[PDB]
Amino acid sequence: TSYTLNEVVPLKEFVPEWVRIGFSATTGAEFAAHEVLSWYFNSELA
Amino acid sequence: TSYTLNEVVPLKEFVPEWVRIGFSATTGAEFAAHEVLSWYFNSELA
Amino acid sequence: TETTSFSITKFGPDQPNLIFQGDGYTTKERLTLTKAVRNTVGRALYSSPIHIWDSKTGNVANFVTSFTFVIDAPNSYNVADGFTFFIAPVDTKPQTGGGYLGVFNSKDYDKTSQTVAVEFDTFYNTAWDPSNGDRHIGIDVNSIKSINTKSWALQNGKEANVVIAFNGATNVLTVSLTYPN
Amino acid sequence: TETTSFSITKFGPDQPNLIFQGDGYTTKERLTLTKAVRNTVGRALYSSPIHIWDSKTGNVANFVTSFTFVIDAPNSYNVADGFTFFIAPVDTKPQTGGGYLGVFNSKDYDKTSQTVAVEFDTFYNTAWDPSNGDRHIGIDVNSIKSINTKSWALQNGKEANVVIAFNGATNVLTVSLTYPN
Amino acid sequence: HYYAVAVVKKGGSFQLNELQGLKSCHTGLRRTAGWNVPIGTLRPFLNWTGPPEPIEAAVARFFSASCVPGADKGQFPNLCRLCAGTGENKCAFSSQEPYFSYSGAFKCLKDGAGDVAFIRESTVFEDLSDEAERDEYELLCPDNTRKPVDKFKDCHLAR
Amino acid sequence: HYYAVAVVKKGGSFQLNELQGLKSCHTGLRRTAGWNVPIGTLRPFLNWTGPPEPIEAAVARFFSASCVPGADKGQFPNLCRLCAGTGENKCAFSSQEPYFSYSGAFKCLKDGAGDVAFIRESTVFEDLSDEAERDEYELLCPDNTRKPVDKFKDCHLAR
Ligand SMILES: *[C@@H]1O[C@H](CO[C@@H]2O[C@@H](C)[C@@H](O)[C@@H](O)[C@@H]2O)[C@@H](O[C@@H]2O[C@H](CO)[C@@H](O[C@@H]3O[C@H](CO[C@H]4O[C@H](CO)[C@@H](O)[C@H](O)[C@@H]4O[C@@H]4O[C@H](CO)[C@@H](O)[C@H](O)[C@H]4NC(C)=O)[C@@H](O)[C@H](O[C@H]4O[C@H](CO)[C@@H](O)[C@H](O)[C@@H]4O[C@@H]4O[C@H](CO)[C@@H](O[C@@H]5O[C@H](CO)[C@H](O)[C@H](O)[C@H]5O)[C@H](O)[C@H]4NC(C)=O)[C@@H]3O)[C@H](O)[C@H]2NC(C)=O)[C@H](O)[C@H]1NC(C)=O
Ligand SMILES: *[C@@H]1O[C@H](CO[C@@H]2O[C@@H](C)[C@@H](O)[C@@H](O)[C@@H]2O)[C@@H](O[C@@H]2O[C@H](CO)[C@@H](O[C@@H]3O[C@H](CO[C@H]4O[C@H](CO)[C@@H](O)[C@H](O)[C@@H]4O[C@@H]4O[C@H](CO)[C@@H](O)[C@H](O)[C@H]4NC(C)=O)[C@@H](O)[C@H](O[C@H]4O[C@H](CO)[C@@H](O)[C@H](O)[C@@H]4O[C@@H]4O[C@H](CO)[C@@H](O[C@@H]5O[C@H](CO)[C@H](O)[C@H](O)[C@H]5O)[C@H](O)[C@H]4NC(C)=O)[C@@H]3O)[C@H](O)[C@H]2NC(C)=O)[C@H](O)[C@H]1NC(C)=O
Ligand SMILES: [Ca+2]
Ligand SMILES: [Ca+2]
Ligand SMILES: [Mn+2]
Ligand SMILES: [Mn+2]
């Protein structure tokens, strides 16, 4: 099954010109395992 | 005009698994300007 | 055109082309963010900063990302807290733990953060989650209370192939999480 | 498959996705290594380390690089010293200046270096250059005295579009420097 | 005939409700007064999502550490952690586990490993046949009251 | 008639050969005894790759800094650096440049700016008409000998 979202986000207005991209999870007074198996990322600026 | 070279270089044997790649020039008791205008680099490991 | 692209398949035990902060590390061919315990922060963010826009010409970037992550919890009735893909200022570090996914700090919009992220939350929070409990996906941006959140089924333990690509021309990001079927 | 790729067109004044060491910096939309002076070292090497081979499976990598550099000297009869594309251990820093292009330290093979590089030298060195003076291109590997060097015309000041791609299957690198004509 | 009771020590207090977190003493898998009954009035706090998750698994986390003879110390290394069974008799069902069955399970309470021990409302007394110590133990009653051993007729979980 | 000579101060020594690096005093572009001749016997050390590189450009680096009236202080900001011309007369060809022409160029040698001054073997004397100072100057002769002003007949570069 698939779950999807689309939303108009004016990126330029919110996050800097130079940005590092990352994965981050957490655990509070409850938990679960969080693991990443692969990763792709291609970004072109005109 | 073009100038080219081909040589069998067993890379694995010479430089580490993880390597940073770079540009470097110098100047001694004589000189000249060294400048880079662009850069491309795509590396795929099977 | 400026263009950076990387494709990681087996997060080896050494894994140099990334930055691990807080807990997080590689393991059996995999990047681990939190080792199923109480109160720990996990985050890893690739080493080279990428530039999205151009101040010199107000041009935004097109970017796509694809990844198969997994949230396997010991108990299918007590998950926590969340997994999120964030974009933030180069000099970025683990923000408030708990239910903030370690990227934000306030429910309220705090312009300063400069962080737009897509969050897959697995623990309802009265103070800022759609009051109906429902685990969900959402698009965060300088808050924690997203601007859009769509409820979704956990499938605790199954691999999940997701992919998200923003549109520079249309300033629109789309996130799709697909459980192999 | 592991895959990293970057394409830089205008080295902006801030330029984060690189590392500048010694002198070297960006300028008028360009990366500068040495500002035409006496005795200075210049080098810049992209921020993310790439992995070429696999110890886990002795597989080497395929890689291509393309760039238009320029060596414009004040006098077409007194150039120095050289420009070189090197590959070396992550924690790498400016080695001996002068005629070593800041990457090596001995004419003699020093296995420890772990640096294979393609060098475009513009200053003959009796001790280790093909005795006939001739400026040239060469393939360095833990020495300075290449294993192959082919003489070439300077064209002082003209842009130069070069490109080099190694062969993983055939362990063979090829360098071509072409002056637009 | 004999009813079911929740036997505790003395030195601080709590009630059946507060159980979560504590270390328990058991007699053995499915041994009624040391499991079957206990798991019944605990089930509500187990958050046990039913099958195929072993109902043992649920109680395997809820209790910080315990001794449940006959428990897979390979998959649930915690239902056996308190087991006094030095050797291959650790968490054993045989009699080589000093805390196996009624008295043993109760003796698990005696050496301050466990805080609650589910052993028949007869054991403890038969066991500690000395006046003072007999007074040195409490008993959790279904209505969350810590009534004394002598009051087991009331302080009994199930019949 | 008058020959060409290389006029230097006194206080340490060197010869025409060692010129490279020093600061020179000139009279002005193409002024024979302050350029044409000098550039002739210097050419070999100029490494001047011919046209279209200005032969001025070559001597523009070879000399650390100087005063050459009529020199493009915009492209060769160094053939003018020593020029005593305070104001828009810096490196000027007019007489507003105190070191313009013979005496001026020689006076460039007098105020320790230049080390060699190419001014006619007449100037210096006419200039410093005082006994002691007349003895306080040397003259470079083609055969790399530092013969005195009085010996200019021999110590002359070209005729
Ligand atoms: C069996 O199942 C049940 C039921 O499960 C639930 O339902 C299922 C369907 C699932 O959805 C499951 O997720 C549900 O839990 C389990 O019972 C539940 O167990 C959870 C987990 O513990 C409880 O949730 C916790 O609640 C705590 C207390 O909440 C109250 O106090 C808060 C302030 O302290 C306040 O914010 C809350 O709103 C609430 O206050 C009021 O409560 C009343 C009554 O409920 C309401 O009427 C009011 O509306 C409400 N507000 C007001 C204004 O009146 C939370 O503390 C706890 O939060 C922590 O964990 C979650 C993630 O798990 C994070 O989101 C939080 O950020 C936080 O993380 C970190 O937690 C630790 C521990 O507190 C903190 O560290 C310590 O903090 C101390 C504070 O003094 C010290 O400072 C100490 O030094 C320090 O180390 C961190 O600081 C903190 N980090 C941050 C950034 O905050 C969590 O939300 C459920 O409440 C509970 N159900 C009920 C009805 O109680 C049962 O556990 C489960 N397991 C078992 C084995 O049986
Ligand atoms: C006008 O044109 C002419 C002709 O140009 C030449 O031809 C054209 C076609 C072009 O190819 C052009 O490139 C040619 O130059 C120019 O004249 C030439 O000018 C150059 C530039 O100065 C001279 O080359 C220099 O030679 C120096 C001296 O060489 C002798 O000593 C060396 C040891 O000290 C030794 O290694 C040499 O082999 C040589 O020794 C013997 O010499 C005799 C006679 O020549 C031979 O028969 C023997 O075979 C030979 N060996 C033996 C065993 O006998 C070099 O020092 C100098 O090297 C520096 O620069 C080059 C790059 O330009 C680098 O490769 C070197 O690494 C080195 O770089 C750094 O240099 C500085 C300055 O020395 C050092 O710093 C200082 O070092 C001091 C040493 O005590 C102090 O320690 C001080 O504190 C410190 O700061 C650095 O340490 C050093 N770095 C390193 C890593 O070493 C260079 O090679 C030509 O020799 C000269 N032609 C002739 C015939 O003399 C003319 O300049 C030009 N311009 C003008 C304005 O007219
Ligand atoms: Ca949440
Ligand atoms: Ca060289
Ligand atoms: Mn949320
Ligand atoms: Mn060479």
Curated annotation (Swiss-Prot), chains A, B:
Keywords: Lectin, Mannose-binding
Subunit structure: Tetramer of two alpha and two beta chains.
The keyword Transcription regulation is assigned to this record: no
Pfam family name, one: Lectin_legB
Protein name per Swiss-Prot or TrEMBL: Mannose/glucose-specific lectin alpha 2 chain
Family designation: Belongs to the leguminous lectin family.
Domain of life from the UniProt record: Eukaryota
Gene Ontology molecular function: D-mannose binding
PROSITE patterns hit by this protein: LECTIN_LEGUME_ALPHA
Swiss-Prot record, chains C, D:
Positions in coiled-coil regions: none
GO molecular-function terms, A-Z: D-mannose binding; metal ion binding
Miscellaneous note of the record: Binds one manganese (or another transition metal) ion and one calcium ion. The metal ions are essential for the saccharide-binding and cell-agglutinating activities. The sequence shown is that of the beta-1.
Presence of the UniProt keyword Calcium in the record: yes
Keyword Glycosyltransferase: no
Binding positions (Ca(2+)): 121, 123, 125, 129
Subunit structure: Tetramer of two alpha and two beta chains.
Name recorded for this polypeptide: Lectin beta-1 and beta-2 chains
One Pfam family cited in the UniProt record for this chain: Lectin_legB
Sorted UniProt keywords: Calcium, Lectin, Manganese, Mannose-binding, Metal-binding
Binding of Mn(2+), residues: 119, 121, 129, 136
Xref: InterPro entries: ConA-like_dom_sf, Lectin_legB_Mn/Ca_BS, Legume_lectin_dom, Leguminous_Lectin
Protein's organism: Lathyrus ochrus (Cyprus-vetch)
Record-stated family: Belongs to the leguminous lectin family.
Stored Gene3D superfamilies: 2.60.120.200
Domain of life: Eukaryota
UniProtKB/Swiss-Prot annotation, chains E, F:
Effect of mutating residue 31 to D/E/S: Disrupts anion binding site and destabilizes iron binding
Tissue specificity: High levels are found in saliva and tears, intermediate levels in serum and plasma, and low levels in urine. In kidney, detected in the distal collecting tubules in the medulla but not in the cortical region or in blood vessels. Detected in peripheral blood neutrophils (at protein level). Isoform 1 and isoform DeltaLf are expressed in breast, prostate, spleen, pancreas, kidney, small intestine, lung, skeletal muscle, uterus, thymus and fetal liver. Isoform 1 is expressed in brain, testis and peripheral blood leukocytes; isoform DeltaLf is barely detectable in these tissues.
Sugar-modified residues: 47
PTM info: Poly-N-acetyllactosaminic carbohydrate moiety seems to be needed for TLR4 activation.
Site (Important for iron binding): 120
SS bond list: 25-108, 67-83, 80-91, 141-155
Any coiled-coil regions, as ranges: none
Binding site for Fe(3+) 1: 2, 102
Annotated hydrogencarbonate 1 binding sites: 27, 31, 33-34
Record function comment: Transferrins are iron binding transport proteins which can bind two Fe(3+) ions in association with the binding of an anion, usually bicarbonate. Lactoferricin binds to the bacterial surface and is crucial for the bactericidal functions. Has some antiviral activity against papillomavirus infection. N-terminal region shows strong antifungal activity against C.albicans. Contains two BBXB heparin-binding consensus sequences that appear to form the predominate functional GAG-binding site.
Subunit structure: Monomer. Found in a complex with LTF, CLU, EPPIN and SEMG1. Found in a complex with MPO and LTF; interacts directly with CP, allows Fe(3+) incorporation into LTF and activation of CP ferroxidase activity.
Protein family according to the UniProt entry: Belongs to the transferrin family.
Name of the protein in its database record: Lactotransferrin
Record organism: Homo sapiens (Human)
From-to range in the entire protein, with total length: 110 to 268 of 710
